[PDB]
């Protein structure tokens, strides 16, 4: 128990995510399905989802930014063509 207040919710057929919709405290709140439903990660990894988004289990990995850069100008025209003024 942390947040997401609503009773165990009801998922339809052809599901792959876990979140729900219900009205608690006069605001639309997200609810929770049976802890660990199948995700888009069912026929590629093991699917265990709950608490608003899609989740994966069995394999985990993380990526970092080893490439990057900065740009001073995004256009070489140095103006806007929407106004069409110089």
Show the tokens assigned to 53.
């988004």
- Checking 56-65 for CB contacts under 8 A at 24+ apart, the result is none
CB 8 within 8 A of CB 34: yes
The β-bridge relationship of strands 22-24 and 27-29 is antiparallel
CB 17 within 8 A of CB 49: yes
Show the tokens assigned to 55.
């989740």
Distance separating alpha carbons of residues 34 and 9, to the nearest angstrom: 8
Question: Residue 45 contacts by C-beta under 8 Å, 6 or more apart in sequence?
Answer: 56, 57, 58, 59
DSSP category for residue 57: B
Beta-strand ranges (E) seen in the chain are 22-24, 27-29
The backbone region for 73, taken as left when phi is positive above 0, alpha when psi lies in -120 to 50, beta otherwise, is beta
Show the tokens assigned to 83.
């106004």
Query: What's the distance, CA 52 to chain centroid?
Result: 8
Question: Residue 7 contacts by C-beta under 8 Å, 6 or more apart in sequence?
Answer: 31
Query: What's the distance, CA 7 to chain centroid?
Result: 22
């Amino acid at each position: 128990d942390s947040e997401f207040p609503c009773p165990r919710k009801q998922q339809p057929a052809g599901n792959s995510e876990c979140s729900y919709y219900c009205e608690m405290n006069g605001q639309w709140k997200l609810g929770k399905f049976q802890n660990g439903a199948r995700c888009d990660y069912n026929a590629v990894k093991d699917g265990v989802c709950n608490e608003g988004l899609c989740y994966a289990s069995g394999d985990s990995a993380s990526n970092t930014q080893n490439q990057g850069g900065s740009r001073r100008q995004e256009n070489e025209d140095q103006g806007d063509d929407e106004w069409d003024r110089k």
